[PDB]
Amino acid sequence: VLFAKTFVKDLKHVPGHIRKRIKLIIEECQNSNSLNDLKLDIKKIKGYHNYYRIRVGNYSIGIEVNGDTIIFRRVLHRKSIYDYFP
């Protein structure tokens, strides 16, 4: 697993219980280098090559899967996403 700098800033504004859930995800990612789509809500983002979103409550984790490499790029609340349009 790799983590974009910004993902760390993103994680500062995440409630304790959701960070805990994210930690679990990363831990399971560290043991298996895979994400279980039967246990997690995982969706490929259309119009991009290797972007996926995982839904954790009201938060979406934005990940890039480059080959075998999993990169955690962002974690944002639903309300914060509505702001990323030019």
């Binding site: 697993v1 790799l2 983590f3 974009a4 700098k5 910004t6 993902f7 760390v8 990363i26 560290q30 969706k43 983002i45 259309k46 119009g47 991009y48 972007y51 979103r53 979406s60 934005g62 890039e64 990169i71 790029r73 962002r74 944002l76 639903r78 996403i81 509505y82 702001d83 990323y84 349009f85 030019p86």
Partner: protein, 39 residues
């Protein structure tokens, strides 16, 4: 509350996906940190 279902919900989800992808594009040149480095 305001009813929405359901084809419309999916369309809103697509927009939310694009917003996140765009948020992810802002990190394209970011330093990538290891599992060890992040805390």
């Amino acid at each position: 509350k305001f009813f929405i279902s359901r084809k419309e919900y999916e369309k809103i989800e697509e927009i939310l996906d694009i917003g996140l992808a765009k948020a992810m594009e802002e990190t394209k040149d970011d330093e990538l940190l290891t599992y060890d480095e992040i805390k």
